[PDB]
Each structure stands twice: as structure tokens, then as C-alpha cells.
Design a protein around this ligand. Structure first.
Ligand SMILES: CCCCCCCC/C=C\CCCCCCCC(=O)OC[C@H](O)CO
Ligand SMILES: CCCCCCCC/C=C\CCCCCCCC(=O)OC[C@H](O)CO
Ligand SMILES: *[C@@H]1O[C@H](CO)[C@@H](O)[C@H](O)[C@H]1NC(C)=O
Length: 443
């Protein structure tokens, strides 16, 4: 082709984009150089109107496939170069999933000694707090790893979040609905409702940190989730060992607290309510029996012969069921440490280093041009991906004979950079495009 005769060397490039996305108007000017022999592009685009209202990666597809390297056996399929020097018209409809669409029209021609790309872009129906207008896309053009822990953590913590909400709710119910008094006048906080509220609240904040940290891939929330679980786990084992090295030292302590509380029963309405509800519920009477009430047991005591003591019955219950609560203890512990391992693992597989995209080319007999369609996974700040659905049509501007090709594709690789000197909003881009899809000879 005579168009490839125009592309044997490195050709200066000029790119101009005037755009409008939901009324946000902007202009981009890019300059650079195009080496079609190696399929390399080096360009530096600058936003002439201030700051770009969209993420720079969304513009790189709209921002010259005539510099694609078609290997020698595929050269007779290079429509783009054949359309030169009189150029070709490239139209596109880029549909961002669950968001707006770019609508594009562009003319690519040789103007003087330079290959020029003039584009007007109009975007409609975008979310103002979406990934596009909210600048939530990473500044790159590769695919990112799927973090399945993102979903595992979010799933369990959502369930634990709801469990905690119900535990907190039942505690809120008991604080308002029922009155079981205060067993220890000095520890007013120690009520059955408050312990529900305390444990429920702690569960919700841990589950909240796990949910928000995992689904948004926020390292700081993951570390907070880890540190908080670590602290809860450390207190648990501390209490467990501290409990058994000093069981008898704190056995006395609560026994003093109960004996102190029982002196107040005929003078403190709250401690009376505590003893009355406890005894009538557990069907017990004193600390170790009915003799603790030296003037006679209150009415809310089983009148049976040797009713067991409330404190004795409780300690016997925990000693008799130590094996069960031990199983439940290590169960909550392993769930706890599993979440720690998950979070710590997920944290390490964030912010990593860094891919190819294929533009499938198909001929259009009737408009004497080509069509193309392809999907681009833009990487979102929360780890998810934003689909950009691309449909394309290219028609030659001139009446000269152009080449209509067999189906083939272009393996594009783009590298986004930043000029450390540019104080203006900008994008330094390196691309490598090579044609493929048609194999020659016998292999
Ligand atoms: C809502 C969908 C998720 C619901 C799931 C409910 C069942 C989860 C139970 C066990 C999963 C085992 C957890 C696997 C932990 C390792 C995952 C991992 O590290 O992989 C991440 C990355 O993809 C590199 O491998
Ligand atoms: C506040 C107490 C809960 C903190 C959050 C724990 C971390 C959740 C992650 C994995 C759970 C492991 C799966 C356990 C399966 C049993 C259901
Ligand atoms: C508790 O409430 C009663 C209501 O009968 C009230 O008369 C009294 O001031 C309080 N009783 C004691 C023992 O403090």
C-alpha cells in the first residue's frame, strides 16, 4: 500500500480533543511521535482547560491505530494506513457499565508533515458521584488480580454484623423493657442488658471494620480490623489464664461483693429487685443457702427443703459445663483468628505493581470501512472493575482504494506515566500495538 509508504519512519503526532461530559467542558492537547515499524507510541497529553473532569484512563481509547505494527504476512489487511494520507473517520460509542456513555467522532489525517487526530467527545447520563465523574479509577491501563478474600471477609462480617445488631437490640430491649435491679450497687453497669449491649456493640464495630475494609479494600480499615481483633483476642486469653491462676482469689472477691449486696436488700430497692429476680429465676435462695438470710428468706425463694444457693448453683453450673464453654471459647477464637489471617492476607495483596487488550477488527463491505468492538476493565479504587464497552466504525475520508481485511485483532499495551515537572494536569502515555489473528505458512 501507498499508505504504509507514509509510515516507514517516525511521524510527529498531534492530538486534539474537545469534550463535554454532563455539561463539564474540557480540552486536551497531546503531542508526540509515532513509530509504526515497532508499533510504539510516545505521547504527552495536557488538559488546556485546567483539571480534567474525568479520569485520564477513560480518555486513552478515544485519544491513532494507523501506527499499529502489522507484521509482513498481515500487511495487506492494514486498512488504517491505506486510508492515508487522506485519512479516515473514526466513530465510537463507549458505554460505561452502570454509568454514562461517551459518544465520539474523530478525523485522522496527515496535515502537513504530521499525523493529526481531531476528536469531539460528548458524554451523557453519568453519575456525578460515580466512578467516572467522581475520579475513582486507578491511573493505569492493566487488569488487576481478583481478591477472593474481598468477598469472603465481607460475607462473614455481614452475618456477624447482623448477629451483633440483634444482640445489641435485645440488650436495648432489656435495658428499657425489664428491670432485674443491680446486683452490685458499686458496679451499676453490670446488668444483663448492658453486657448484651457491650458485647453486641463491640461485635458491630468489628464487623463494620471487616465489611468496609474488605469490600472497599481500605488497608487502614483492614489494619484497624486486625488490631482490634488482636486486642480482643489478647484480652480473652489473658482473662482465661488470669481466671484460673486466681480462681480462688476472685472467688472470695465476688463472695464479698454478694455478702455486701445482701446487707442492702431491705434498704436498696435495686438490689432487692436483683436478688428477687435471680432467686425466682434460678430457683435458688442465698449465696450458699437459705441461711444467708438470717431473718428468714424472702418470698422470692423456693420454699423447698434444701434449695441450693444461688452462688453455689452458678459455680457448680460453670464447673459442670466447663467442657462446653471451652469448646465455644475456642470456636469464637478460631473464627476470630481466621478473620485476622484473612485480613492480614488480603492487606498484603493490595497496592501491587501492575496487561493486554485486544481490539477485534471486522470489515464492513457497505461503508468501505471497518468495525470493532471491545471491553476495557478500568480498575476502581475499591478493587472492583469498571466496564467500558466500545463499539467502533472507521470510514475512509478519501476516494482512494482502501484495504478491507479478514477478521483480525490488535493487541494493545498502554503504560500511563506522569511528567514530574508538569504542574498542569496531564498524561504521559506509551503504547505498543501489534496486529495478530491471522497465521501464515504451515506451523
Ligand atoms: C459471597 C461470596 C463469598 C461467600 C463465601 C462463603 C464460603 C467461604 C468459606 C470458605 C472460603 C475459604 C476462604 C479462602 C481464603 C483464601 C482466599 C485467597 O487468599 O485468595 C485470594 C486471591 O484470589 C488469591 O488466591
Ligand atoms: C466480633 C466477633 C466476630 C469478628 C469477625 C470474625 C471474622 C470473620 C471472618 C471469618 C470467620 C471465619 C468463619 C467462621 C465460620 C463459622 C460461622
Ligand atoms: C423503695 O421504694 C419504696 C416504695 O414502696 C419506697 O417507699 C422506699 O423509699 C424505698 N424503700 C427502701 C427500703 O429504700
Amino acid at each position: 500500500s501507498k499508505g504504509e509508504e507514509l509510515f516507514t519512519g517516525v511521524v510527529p503526532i498531534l492530538v486534539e480533543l474537545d469534550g463535554d461530559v454532563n455539561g463539564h467542558k474540557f480540552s486536551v492537547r497531546g503531542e508526540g511521535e509515532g513509530d509504526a515499524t515497532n508499533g510504539k507510541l510516545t505521547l504527552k497529553f495536557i488538559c488546556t482547560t485546567g483539571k480534567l473532569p474525568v479520569p485520564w484512563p477513560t480518555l486513552v481509547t478515544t485519544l491513532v491505530q494507523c501506527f499499529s505494527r502489522y507484521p509482513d504476512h498481515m500487511k495487506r489487511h492494514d486498512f488504517f494506513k491505506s486510508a492515508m494520507p487522506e485519512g479516515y473517520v473514526q466513530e465510537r460509542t463507549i458505554s460505561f457499565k452502570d454509568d454514562g456513555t461517551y459518544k465520539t467522532r474523530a478525523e485522522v489525517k496527515f496535515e502537513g508533515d504530521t499525523l493529526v487526530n481531531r476528536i469531539e467527545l460528548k458524554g451523557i447520563d453519568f453519575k456525578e458521584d460515580g466512578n467516572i465523574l467522581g475520579h475513582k479509577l486507578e491511573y493505569n491501563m492493566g487488569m488487576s488480580s481478583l481478591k477472593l478474600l474481598k468477598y469472603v471477609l465481607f460475607f462473614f462480617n455481614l452475618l456477624f454484623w447482623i448477629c451483633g445488631c440483634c444482640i445489641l437490640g435485645f440488650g436495648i430491649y432489656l435495658l428499657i423493657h425489664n428491670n432485674f435491679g443491680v446486683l452490685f450497687h458499686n458496679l451499676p453497669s453490670l446488668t444483663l442488658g448492658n453486657v448484651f449491649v457491650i458485647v453486641g456493640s463491640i461485635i458491630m464495630v468489628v464487623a463494620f471494620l471487616g465489611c468496609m475494609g474488605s469490600i472497599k479494600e481500605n488497608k487502614s480499615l483492614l489494619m484497624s480490623f486486625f488490631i482490634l481483633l488482636l486486642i480482643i483476642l489478647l484480652a480473652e486469653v489473658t482473662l482465661a489464664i488470669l481466671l484460673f491462676v486466681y480462681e480462688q482469689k476472685l472467688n472470695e472477691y465476688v463472695a464479698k461483693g454478694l455478702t455486701d449486696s445482701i446487707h442492702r436488700y431491705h434498704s436498696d430497692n435495686s438490689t432487692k429487685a436483683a436478688w428477687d429476680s435471680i432467686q425466682s429465676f434460678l430457683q435458688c435462695c442465698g449465696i450458699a443457702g437459705t441461711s444467708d438470710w438470717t431473718s428468714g428468706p424472702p418470698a422470692s425463694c423456693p420454699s423447698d427443703r434444701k434449695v441450693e444457693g444461688c452462688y453455689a448453683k452458678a459455680r457448680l453450673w460453670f464447673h459442670s459445663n466447663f467442657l462446653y464453654i471451652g469448646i465455644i471459647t475456642i470456636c469464637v477464637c478460631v473464627i476470630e483468628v481466621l478473620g485476622m489471617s484473612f485480613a492480614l492476607t488480603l492487606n498484603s495483596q493490595i497496592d501491587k505493581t501492575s496487561n493486554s487488550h485486544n481490539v477485534y477488527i471486522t470489515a464492513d463491505k457497505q461503508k468501505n470501512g471497518i468495525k470493532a468492538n471491545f471491553k476495557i476493565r478500568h480498575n476502581v479504587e475499591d478493587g472492583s472493575v469498571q466496564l467500558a464497552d466500545h463499539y467502533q466504525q472507521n470510514t475512509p475520508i478519501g476516494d482512494g482504494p482502501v484495504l478491507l481485511p479478514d477478521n483480525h485483532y490488535l493487541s494493545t499495551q498502554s503504560v500511563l506515566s506522569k511528567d514530574p515537572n508538569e504542574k498542569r494536569d496531564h498524561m504521559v502515555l506509551l503504547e505498543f500495538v501489534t496486529a495478530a489473528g491471522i497465521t501464515h505458512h504451515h506451523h
